[PDB]
Curated annotation (Swiss-Prot):
Gene Ontology MF term list: ATP binding; ATP hydrolysis activity; ATP-dependent DNA damage sensor activity; damaged DNA binding; single-stranded DNA binding
One Pfam family of this chain: RecA
Taxonomic source organism: Mycolicibacterium smegmatis (strain ATCC 700084 / mc(2)155) (Mycobacterium smegmatis)
Gene this chain is encoded by: recA
Domain of life: Bacteria
Protein name: Protein RecA
Length: 319
């Protein structure tokens, strides 16, 4: 009577119907539920996520050591959302954002809502208020670790209460998540951190998120001796809308955003479109150059090509 696959599907079926789509899923499975998404700004990452970009109306956490490339991504997200004509909110509690660098990645600073909370409750709440107005496409909280409870701030944390922050984070996230889902507003909590300590607030953020990104830096992009930027690596450690654990890499040159041409030269190679002979790159006849960098330039100057690689790559996968 038992037909494991017939019995297994029926099991998964109920499981989703009981806890939500994606509550369980074969890793090879290839999701086909196209959800509204905010493009990460890194094609590779956008594919790693398995749905094009950050899922809308979800809580997204981006953690990693300082300079890992978190903000950048985050900034890009805002940027792509504004192009889709969405409004963006930035609950700043670190005062580091450099609007100028933002404008560079495509952000419309002049139309960006910004708030610099006096307390942690204040911040989270201000956010909650903004979210439930259903007007924002995306909201990004800078530094989970900075949402220090009011009590701790005022200096009354005289060893008379402890752990207050997680709670602050947990309860806050209990409320907002709901509202978020209805508004469709994506919320990116930038968790610049410090296994699994979580800087005091990732405890509750670990369960409320639907997508958790692990941003890390792996190598300094060079030519020969002179540097040009750094290659970041991300690992979607959690994904409740597509098979998790995939990962992508992308280049960010000093002062720039996620290098399109880089992504091109990267996904081109693995995918076959662009061939690499030792220390050289070639694209169906044409020579790109000796070394990823000259190639990058090459693709920067010859707009048509590359634009066509983006094409072929964008075809072999969903564009």
């Amino acid at each position: 009577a038992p037909d494991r696959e017939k019995a297994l599907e029926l099991a998964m079926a109920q499981i989703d119907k009981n806890f939500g789509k994606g509550s369980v899923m074969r890793l090879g499975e290839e999701v086909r539920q196209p959800i509204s998404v905010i493009p990460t700004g890194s094609i590779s990452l956008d594919v790693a996520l398995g749905i094009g970009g950050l899922p809308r109306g979800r809580v997204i956490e981006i953690y990693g050591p300082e300079s890992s490339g978190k903000t950048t991504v985050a900034l890009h997200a805002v940027a792509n959302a504004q192009a889709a004509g969405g409004i963006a909110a930035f609950i700043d509690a670190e005062h580091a954002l450099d609007p100028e660098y933002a404008k560079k990645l495509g952000v419309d600073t002049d139309s960006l809502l910004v708030s610099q909370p006096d307390t942690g409750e204040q911040a989270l709440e201000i956010a909650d208020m903004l979210v439930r107005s259903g007007a924002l496409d995306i909201i990004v909280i800078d530094s989970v670790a900075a949402l220090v409870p009011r009590a701790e701030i005022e200096g009354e944390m005289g060893d008379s209460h402890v752990g207050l922050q997680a709670r602050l984070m947990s309860q806050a996230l209990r409320k907002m998540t709901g509202a978020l889902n209805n508004s469709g507003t994506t919320a990116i909590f930038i968790n610049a951190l410090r296994s699994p300590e979580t800087t005091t607030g990732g405890k509750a953020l670990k369960f409320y998120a639907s997508v958790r990104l692990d941003v890390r830096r792996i190598e300094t992009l060079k030519d020969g001796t002179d540097a040009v930027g750094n290659r970041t690596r991300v690992k979607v450690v959690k994904n409740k809308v597509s098979p998790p654990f995939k990962q992508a890499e992308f280049d960010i040159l000093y002062g720039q955003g996620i290098s399109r041409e880089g992504s091109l030269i990267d996904m081109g190679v693995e995918h076959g479109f662009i061939r690499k002979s030792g220390s050289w790159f070639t694209y169906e006849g044409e020579q790109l150059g000796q070394g990823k960098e000259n190639a990058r330039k090459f693709l920067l100057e010859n707009t048509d090509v590359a634009n066509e690689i983006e094409k072929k790559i964008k075809e072999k996968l969903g564009i």
